[PDB]
Structure 1
Amino acid sequence: GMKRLTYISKFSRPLSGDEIEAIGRISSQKNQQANVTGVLLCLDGIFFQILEGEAEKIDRIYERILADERHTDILCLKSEVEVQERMFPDWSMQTINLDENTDFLIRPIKVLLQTLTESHRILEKYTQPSIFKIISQGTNPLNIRPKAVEKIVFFSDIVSFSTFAEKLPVEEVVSVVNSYFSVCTAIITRQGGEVTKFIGDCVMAYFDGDCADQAIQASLDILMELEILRNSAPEGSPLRVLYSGIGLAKGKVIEGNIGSELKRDYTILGDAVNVAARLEALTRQLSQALVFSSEVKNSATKSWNFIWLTDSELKGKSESIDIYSIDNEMTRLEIARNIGHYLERV
């Protein structure tokens, strides 16, 4: 059946009007051979494209388009599955270069398009990466039916964050937290997790319920990167005393259209506050940078060097759960007093 994608992208490099003409002419030739139709517009370094045709052919062309080095920041705004008729039946690929168009009525429209796209790019930064994935799969996020799914939940925090905020100017605190968040988000994403929110200095993320190995690997990689960061920072850098505690648990997450008219969310983990606070307490109490429950340990498939540490309570239920870590050089209140002294004289 027929599929129609709409996406926007950014010129990765300046492109002349003749290069854009060539892109359109090659696309028209290739699309004609594939029975694909659509339209390509450019304006001030932005591409807009609509492609329609057999789902199979569309997905293969779009993969090729994703790899084309001449644009970047590809965002699919809309994916329509089960499309009934073509919008552009006579256009294998029609190319409309708006930079070159001087028509009277199109001038205000170009301003509007530019403004909508730019506002769209701002909003893209402040939205959960996971809404865009639902869109790309062809569903309106506001119309998802609720579902409960087991996840591995990741929480990490900054040791003695309050000391940073007390001892450094706000711009330096923000530089520290942004380095932290950048390290965590990059590694979690590369291991297939999704960061769902920042709660103060705490990063909250999900992994699929059978992806314990990926969650553990991501945790170890974060610890290794922070060690590299502390060692390699300039003399006197506040980054030298950036440490993190990480906890992993298993939870039942609800996915759906959650919230109010004023604010929506895609997912809810009930009592997230309490699980995170209990895991931060464990990492301090055990002086262990990584702790996780037996449920996480039992969902793993690789032969990790597990070490049993203690019993604890993670959910408000009075169930006593075994807490494990990984026994390696990395993982092998203390840090808080060191933090303050160092930050005092930098």
Structure 2
Amino acid sequence: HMKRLTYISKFSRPLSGDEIEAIGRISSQKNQQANVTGVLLCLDGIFFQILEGEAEKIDRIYERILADERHTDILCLKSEVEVQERMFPDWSMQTINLDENTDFLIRPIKVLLQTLTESHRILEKYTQPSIFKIISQGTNPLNIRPKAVEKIVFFSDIVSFSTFAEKLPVEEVVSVVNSYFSVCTAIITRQGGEVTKFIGDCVMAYFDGDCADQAIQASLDILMELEILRNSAPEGSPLRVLYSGIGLAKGKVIEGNIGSELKRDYTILGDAVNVAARLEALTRQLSQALVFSSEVKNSATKSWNFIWLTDSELKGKSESIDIYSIDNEMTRKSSGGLEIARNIGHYLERV
């Protein structure tokens, strides 16, 4: 099996001739001890690199490049798993600095490579990094046929969020939404989870089938990070009255490409999604900042201090579902805030 890695990279520090040449030197040298090949390119503070060789050798090389101080946003563009005949056998790493040389046919292609990457950097921010990992794994996400997979759906939102949008100016509101979103996304990803949607102030994420505990943990930390943010903010910041509401549900969902021909997403779709959505909806009524289904509770390895709440039902297998929260110091501090939903408005009046 022969691999083919292609990627883009940004210059973290403005590199000069001596530094650029040094990168080109080591590359051709080390590749000879591993038989591996490829081509290096350069333009307006951007790197372009193709690589060919053995899967175990090639994967070790890419890992090393990710540690360099002058490298930021190392995005793999294509990864061919099985290759019969290498497209670059006569070379090792023939560096091509287009920043220096200017010809006739190259001049238009130069502008092209600048605008193409520029645009590719703009899309990168608006695309779900879940698809980028798929490309890097060596698969076209559009080619993925939908599958039946059991998962834990996470659904959260900002408590009495409408009062922020009603009182505060448009700029102040979005910074608070984004703040919350960037917090919620961070904790979930690091816990091996995936944020897949947003709607107003809603966040919708998912974790593995067995990842019940990792999900419970993620919700507790979201509350935790918000507790610090409620106090540690200065007197005259809306971030003081920021509270979350979280819902979790386990079940079999359909994950794949779901949307119009124009725009789609590699997300989940199932009954569990709505089960979570509706459970979270109940956090303001149950006065518990965290709410989850009995299936989540049973799927847990750890023996958490679970609270049982007045069971309610909707769709599914027609049968009723049991609602559970967790009795913790963090939950107690956050579950009381749902009855402070009228004391938050008093604060937002002054600002």
8 Å CA contact 1:279, 1:314 repeated in 2 = no
Cα shift readout 1:177-222 (whole Å, capped 9, x = no counterpart): 0110111111111111111010221101110011111111111111
Change over 3 Å in CA distance of 1:274–1:253 after alignment to 2 = closer
**Whole-Å Cα distance in 1 between the matches of residues 267 and 171 of structure 2?**
32
**Whole-Å Cα distance in 2 between the matches of residues 211 and 280 of structure 1?**
19
**Whole-Å Cα distance in 2 between the matches of residues 111 and 15 of structure 1?**
21
**Secondary structure, counterpart of 1:100 in structure 2:** coil
**Whole-Å Cα distance in 2 between the matches of residues 37 and 86 of structure 1?**
9
8 Å CA contact 1:144, 1:256 repeated in 2 = yes
**Whole-Å Cα distance in 1 between the matches of residues 273 and 344 of structure 2?**
25
Deviation (angstroms), 1:225: 0.4
8 Å CA contact 1:52, 1:86 repeated in 2 = yes
Deviation (angstroms), 1:267: 2.4
Change over 3 Å in CA distance of 1:301–1:271 after alignment to 2 = closer
**Secondary structure, counterpart of 1:89 in structure 2:** coil
Change over 3 Å in CA distance of 1:69–1:306 after alignment to 2 = same
8 Å CA contact 1:253, 1:267 repeated in 2 = no
**Whole-Å Cα distance in 2 between the matches of residues 214 and 277 of structure 1?**
19
The reply on whether 1:334 has 2:339 as its aligned counterpart is yes
**TM-score (norm: length of structure 1):** 0.95
Change over 3 Å in CA distance of 1:155–1:339 after alignment to 2 = same
1:317 corresponds in structure 2 to 317
8 Å CA contact 1:274, 1:315 repeated in 2 = no
Change over 3 Å in CA distance of 1:315–1:92 after alignment to 2 = farther
1:302 corresponds in structure 2 to 302
Deviation (angstroms), 1:72: 1.4
Deviation (angstroms), 1:8: 0.6
Deviation (angstroms), 1:316: 5.0
8 Å CA contact 2:153, 2:272 repeated in 1 = no
8 Å CA contact 2:154, 2:247 repeated in 1 = yes
**TM-score (norm: length of structure 2):** 0.94
Deviation (angstroms), 1:307: 2.2
2:202 corresponds in structure 1 to 202
Identity %: 100
Deviation (angstroms), 1:291: 1.1
RMSD: 1.6
8 Å CA contact 2:250, 2:272 repeated in 1 = no
8 Å CA contact 2:151, 2:208 repeated in 1 = yes
- Runs ≥4 residues deviating over 6 A: none
8 Å CA contact 2:251, 2:272 repeated in 1 = no
Q: More displaced, 316-325 or 285-294?
A: 316-325
Cα shift readout 1:229-266 (whole Å, capped 9, x = no counterpart): 11011111111101000111113222223333212221
Change over 3 Å in CA distance of 1:47–1:303 after alignment to 2 = same
8 Å CA contact 2:36, 2:51 repeated in 1 = yes
Change over 3 Å in CA distance of 1:281–1:259 after alignment to 2 = closer
Cα shift readout 1:288-344 (whole Å, capped 9, x = no counterpart): 111111111122112322222231225555321111112110111623211211111
Change over 3 Å in CA distance of 1:152–1:314 after alignment to 2 = farther
Cα shift readout 1:19-57 (whole Å, capped 9, x = no counterpart): 122111111111111111001112121111111111111
8 Å CA contact 2:305, 2:327 repeated in 1 = yes
Cα shift readout 1:115-165 (whole Å, capped 9, x = no counterpart): 110101111111111111111111111111221101111111000111111
**Unpaired runs of at least 5, structure 1:** none
**Whole-Å Cα distance in 2 between the matches of residues 315 and 217 of structure 1?**
28
Change over 3 Å in CA distance of 1:277–1:144 after alignment to 2 = closer
8 Å CA contact 1:9, 1:75 repeated in 2 = yes
8 Å CA contact 1:158, 1:245 repeated in 2 = yes
**Whole-Å Cα distance in 2 between the matches of residues 315 and 95 of structure 1?**
61
**Whole-Å Cα distance in 1 between the matches of residues 274 and 257 of structure 2?**
23
1:343 corresponds in structure 2 to 348
8 Å CA contact 2:255, 2:269 repeated in 1 = no
**Secondary structure, counterpart of 1:331 in structure 2:** helix
**Unpaired runs of at least 5, structure 2:** 333-337
Aligned residues: 345
Q: More displaced, 297-306 or 320-329?
A: 297-306
Change over 3 Å in CA distance of 1:282–1:216 after alignment to 2 = same
Q: More displaced, 166-175 or 259-268?
A: 259-268
**Secondary structure, counterpart of 1:73 in structure 2:** strand
8 Å CA contact 1:156, 1:204 repeated in 2 = yes
Q: More displaced, 276-285 or 324-333?
A: 276-285
Q: More displaced, 222-231 or 252-261?
A: 252-261
**Secondary structure, counterpart of 1:35 in structure 2:** coil
Cα shift readout 1:69-127 (whole Å, capped 9, x = no counterpart): 22011111111110121111111111111111122221221111111101011111111
8 Å CA contact 1:310, 1:324 repeated in 2 = no
Change over 3 Å in CA distance of 1:338–1:314 after alignment to 2 = farther
8 Å CA contact 1:42, 1:97 repeated in 2 = yes
